[PDB]
């Protein structure tokens, strides 16, 4: 039921079965699916495609105008959102800018929590946790099972990798490969091992962590350079397809790749003062 | 005065002097005490009980659902707030859950100030201040007279003692002795002394100070472990009652209590290299 | 236009071209001014005063009560805003108090983004960028064409000159001179260098550029102590006028000015190790 005391334009698409409450503004061309609801105090901008089962929470704005300043008014924006999310109190989701498409998107079954914001062009995928005042600059893309911490930030144009920890605070300012966990390290982040926590409650077995982990020790451990263990990565996965979303994040890398930048003091060479 | 543009459900008991302003919308069972002032667009959550003389701005939302996996709808929950409070725009307080009690509960005399949140099962006791962007995760307890400073985070059951004063952007994973000051170790948080400020302020004297910081060395500057300090501690809040919050706080920590790990560079035996 | 749902006290002097939308709330003795929009569910404290052409979004809350222990109801609080801003989703900006002038004032063609906090007392200035999650505490003032990242915190009574970039969640505690980029030292902030691509975009030259850098490395390079940098910058000042910024914020300090604590190790002193 749309209750009296909301403003839709009579342009809007609302399924039957939504639930739009009191004191909601909903703007031009808006489609809102079946069992969607909407508490209160919530602002649904022009052109804003939502699916089904949503629960979306008072003062979420969704779909309005971009933080950019290359946009001007005449551009189209848009925000699209799946099926099965809950969008928490004073989340902020903006609608894509011209110089991409113009496109804003969230998968399905996510939990996108207080203050949380998605900015213009982002590209959110599904099973994501956004704790409590993430902030997510233009341009990111969150692969599934992801979870970001509180307050956690990132950077325009970086990645996080499927099934990716990323703690309290962190800085994200370079593309984070999959199952990886990250910590703060008090002004940007560091690769703190594999998500080993995530990954075993997800139904991860023995062989597949085993084979996540020598990938880790490829990528920070062996002494490498990123050109020989991607090399050393790409044949890994071969053989052992749960590795593939490494070959995605690191081979399409737009900002470069998460390091650990004090590698050389734990790595193999500093570890093997002995024979055998 | 209940404002004719408000919404408020019809077995909610608002006293006659509560003033209930434009475009609130207050649930079912909820009961708001004498003299509260509910500014503007404020929602409040079924169930929620509010004292006396509160003072609640716009787009703060309390009682309301409790991010929490382990919930569901059917579960109770519940806000409890005292008397006497201040709490300012966009801060969102949830109820309880199941696994406790499924109450969130708030005393008096406190501020809470722009975006903070106070997550389900949280125990805030009186005269705190919460300055802007505090994070308090599920089952957090704040003492009486604390002062998290702004942007500061309290992971799960973390407890922050009486008089304690918590630095910018500091984070709390383990609790917090009463009368600490707390600084940010970038990631993390350290003790940097005693609360003199606040305790001064409040009418401790000389004599309180001088045992309160005698127990900060005990704790943190004599080379003892947790069990022999604790030990010592215990007996000197025999005879100065002024300790007694120390006994609480450590003898029923569930995280562990908050320690320099740098305290071996600093404490007696590092500063004793004469006799006499 | 003023919306037939929006909240408008009698007093209030609204030009015919302002857009006040639906369910904003308009407090008493306020002037709004031509071609400013309010977009939904804007709140607009007493006594405030908005300029023409500005932009401001949903759940912001302007001119309200300072959050100032020292404030009592009966005290005149102000929030004077000029022409051409855009204030973002969840934005606020609190009124002055009677310590001062109470007065909280914001100047013309600023981008305040989402979550943004202009605490009691502040003065910004024109063509600032505070980007999301911004704090500023009481007294702080902004420069000119400052940019102030994501989630930067500013304590009281500091100075941020014209021109400066402060990076994602630094913590600024002293003034920052003109030009200069900040980044964050995990807790607190540092001098990184000069702000080269703000200052190229806005039209400076070389020779410009030049004399800043100079200053640069009077300041933070040249092992002098501040008495005697500050000696050499007024005389600097003398020839080239671009530098006049740096007599007015090192001049007028209230907080002391931002330092290299770590300078000695990167100094002229550090780095001469041979004639010539």
């Keep these: 039921m749309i209750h009296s005391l909301a403003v839709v334009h009579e342009s809007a698409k609302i399924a039957d079965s939504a639930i739009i409450g009191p004191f909601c503004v909903i703007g031009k061309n808006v489609v809102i699916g079946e069992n969607t609801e909407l ?20 003062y979420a704005s969704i779909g309005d105008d971009p933080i950019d300043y290359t946009y001007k008014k005449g551009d189209f924006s848009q925000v699209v959102i799946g099926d099965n999310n809950i969008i928490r109190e004073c989340a902020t989701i903006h609608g894509g800018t011209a110089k991409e498409i113009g496109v804003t998107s969230v998968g399905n079954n996510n939990i996108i929590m207080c203050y949380v914001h998605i900015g213009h062009d982002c590209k959110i995928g599904s099973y994501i946790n956004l704790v409590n005042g993430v902030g997510l600059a233009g341009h990111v893309h969150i692969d599934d099972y992801a979870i970001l911490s509180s307050n956690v930030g990132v950077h325009q144009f970086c990645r996080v990798g499927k099934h990716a920890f990323i703690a ?109």
């Design 39 to 58: 508490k209160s105090h919530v602002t649904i901008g022009d052109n804003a495609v939502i699916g089904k089962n949503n629960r979306i929470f008072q």
């Design 168 to 276: 309290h605070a962190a800085l994200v300012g370079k593309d984070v490969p999959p199952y990886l966990m990250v910590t703060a390290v008090n002004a940007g982040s560091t690769p703190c091992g594999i998500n080993t926590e995530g990954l075993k409650r997800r139904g991860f077995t023995p062989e597949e962590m085993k084979k996540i982990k020598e990938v880790y020790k490829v990528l920070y451990r062996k002494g490498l350079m990123m050109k020989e263990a991607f090399e050393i990565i790409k044949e890994m996965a071969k053989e052992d397809k749960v590795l593939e979303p490494f070959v995605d994040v690191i081979g399409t890398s737009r900002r470069g790749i998460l390091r650990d930048p004090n590698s050389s003091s734990v790595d193999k060479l500093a570890a093997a003062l002995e024979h055998h």
